Design an enzyme around this catalytic site. Structure first.
Site, PDB file in Angstrom:
ATOM      1  N   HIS A   1       0.801  -1.214   0.000  1.00  0.00           N
ATOM      2  CA  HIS A   1       0.000   0.000   0.000  1.00  0.00           C
ATOM      3  C   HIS A   1       0.842   1.275   0.000  1.00  0.00           C
ATOM      4  O   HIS A   1       0.269   2.375  -0.018  1.00  0.00           O
ATOM      5  CB  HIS A   1      -1.000   0.112   1.158  1.00  0.00           C
ATOM      6  CG  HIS A   1      -0.413   0.193   2.534  1.00  0.00           C
ATOM      7  ND1 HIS A   1       0.070   1.379   3.061  1.00  0.00           N
ATOM      8  CD2 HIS A   1      -0.502  -0.662   3.582  1.00  0.00           C
ATOM      9  CE1 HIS A   1       0.398   1.199   4.325  1.00  0.00           C
ATOM     10  NE2 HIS A   1       0.049  -0.027   4.669  1.00  0.00           N
TER      11      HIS A   1
ATOM     12  N   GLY B   1       2.763   5.618  10.487  1.00  0.00           N
ATOM     13  CA  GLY B   1       4.135   5.549  10.028  1.00  0.00           C
ATOM     14  C   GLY B   1       4.911   4.324  10.491  1.00  0.00           C
ATOM     15  O   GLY B   1       6.020   4.116  10.005  1.00  0.00           O
TER      16      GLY B   1
ATOM     17  N   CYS C   1       3.981   1.343   9.689  1.00  0.00           N
ATOM     18  CA  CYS C   1       3.821   0.272   8.717  1.00  0.00           C
ATOM     19  C   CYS C   1       5.169  -0.187   8.204  1.00  0.00           C
ATOM     20  O   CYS C   1       6.077   0.617   7.985  1.00  0.00           O
ATOM     21  CB  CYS C   1       2.963   0.716   7.545  1.00  0.00           C
ATOM     22  SG  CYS C   1       1.278   0.782   8.041  1.00  0.00           S
TER      23      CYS C   1
END
Ligand code: CL
Ligand code: CL
Ligand code: NA
Ligand code: NA
Lengths: 300, 300
Positions: free
Chosen positions: B41, B139, B141
């Site tokens: 993503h 953030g 991820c």
């Protein structure tokens, strides 16, 4: 969201851990530049563990009595000196992995990460607080001495604790990296016991603020309290006194959440009276006291 | 002694963490050999069909920073929900590693990161509902979960999203989600969770090893009898393999698993009567049998 006991990333400390051996005794050491720091009781023998005279025991040692191994490399000891209860071994090689670092002595309630190690090899990392009675509730086995406690705010490892012993209640005691014990403890096996421990009030309040930030309000109430009335109550639950410094320190979290510090104090008073009634706060059924105001801001 | 939630030492994984930016999105990547792994993503949306968005991208659209150094992307491919960015330099800090997929109930360490910089380490269990109770802000991820066996890092988890209940979801390092989740901003909920029975039992054994014994009783039960209780309390079924896995701890303490199950029954039915186990007022289920053995024996 979420809220856990988060340790600091341990890699900067891992690269500093070495094994120190003296006679039959092996423990861990901390290698920064060309010095290895370790508990001075590495020079003790089974004979004198009650009343070692460290000065007399050290003067009898030669550099080559100290076996220091960094991984599979033997380091060469070229000098030695004692500072309080820490031995400093000068070695012939500066650790190329030395981080930016400082030595700090912490106050009760402060938190830090411990890198538990055995034989110079790291086993695990966890978060600990310096209890009001100057012990820590750690996870150590024999051979963990010389494991260290640290923070890594910003650029730089702040070494705050070195492990030296385990007290009869299963709690742990050690020194700062200048070799001064936290608390009244000494590096002798004479009978010693931790003082009665108490709860770190300011940290409990921080964590209640963390809970509000994470979106939970069930424990608040419409009341306030004076600081003095709060302390009169909280002392009856073996809570540490809350000081004006503590009230000041909580200001930011108060502002962030819109809950006045003394109103949160009133929520805590009621939690001590009622308990949880089958509910939890941030996944705990106990009031948690090993998160500081600084930790809450760091993580939330 | 002592028993703490303990994470693996994180340095081997710290040296693999990088920052990946593309479009407006910044998140973390894992640099191993000459490939950076991160959530797919990260690729710029225009409800996505991630293949078509990816041909629009040019290698130089992915800005990858390893510390203060840019890594040159020379290729890109997708594997399930993970993007694989080929770079021109093999990570000289690549550890011995493999990619593994864990089962619900197994534990692992998470190295929480922001902008490619490790911030914190903590220990998690993959919940029966395939979520994890982590601590993540925007953030995080691309932060990863892992175990270490000897010198080998087994990567098992990569963070992709937070669910409305505050828990976290992600994939293995081959991009397969854990749980019935998809990587898009949509109506997604964690299923009802349950308690990891074999792990509660392991932790009761850990308690006994550390001297916490009040909950023991003289009684024993049957798998079938206990599983009816488990089911009533939203506990996972106990299987014969669980019993066998706990073998070592039963031998070491003299409490057979079904003996301990009778203790867990009484705890489920009557509560803890104001007492605590290992400092907890709840039954803790994020320690595996192996975790208890490993910490009550000192592996590095
Ligand atoms: Cl301090
Ligand atoms: Cl609890
Ligand atoms: Na980095
Ligand atoms: Na029993």
């Amino acid at each position: 969201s979420g809220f856990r006991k988060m340790a600091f990333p341990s890699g900067k400390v891992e690269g500093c851990m070495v094994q120190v051996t003296c006679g039959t005794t092996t423990l861990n050491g901390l290698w920064l530049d060309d010095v290895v720091y370790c508990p001075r009781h590495v020079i003790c023998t089974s004979e004198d563990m009650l009343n070692p005279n460290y000065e007399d025991l050290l003067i009898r040692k030669s550099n080559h009595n100290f076996l220091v191994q960094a991984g599979n490399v033997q380091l060469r000891v070229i000098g030695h000196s004692m500072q309080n209860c820490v031995l400093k071994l000068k070695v012939d090689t500066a650790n190329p992995k030395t981080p930016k670092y400082k030595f700090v002595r912490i106050q009760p309630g402060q938190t830090f990460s411990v890198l538990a190690c055995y034989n110079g090899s790291p086993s695990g990392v966890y978060q600990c607080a310096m209890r009001p009675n100057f012990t820590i509730k750690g996870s150590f086995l024999n051979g963990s001495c010389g494991s260290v406690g640290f923070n890594i705010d910003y650029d730089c490892v702040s070494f705050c604790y070195m492990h030296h012993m385990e007290l009869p209640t299963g709690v742990h005691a050690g020194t700062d990296l200048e070799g001064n014990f936290y608390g009244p403890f000494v590096d002798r096996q004479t009978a010693q016991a931790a003082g009665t421990d108490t709860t770190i009030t300011v940290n409990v309040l921080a964590w209640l603020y963390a809970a509000v930030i994470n979106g939970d309000r069930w424990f608040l109430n419409r009341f306030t309290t004076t600081l003095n009335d709060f302390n009169l109550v909280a002392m009856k639950y073996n809570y540490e006194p809350l000081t004006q410094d503590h009230v000041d320190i909580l200001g930011p979290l108060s502002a962030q959440t819109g809950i006045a510090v003394l109103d949160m104090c009133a929520s805590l008073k009621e939690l001590l009276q009622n308990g949880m009634n089958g509910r939890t706060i941030l996944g705990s059924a106990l009031l948690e006291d090993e998160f500081t105001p600084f930790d809450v801001v760091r993580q939330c």
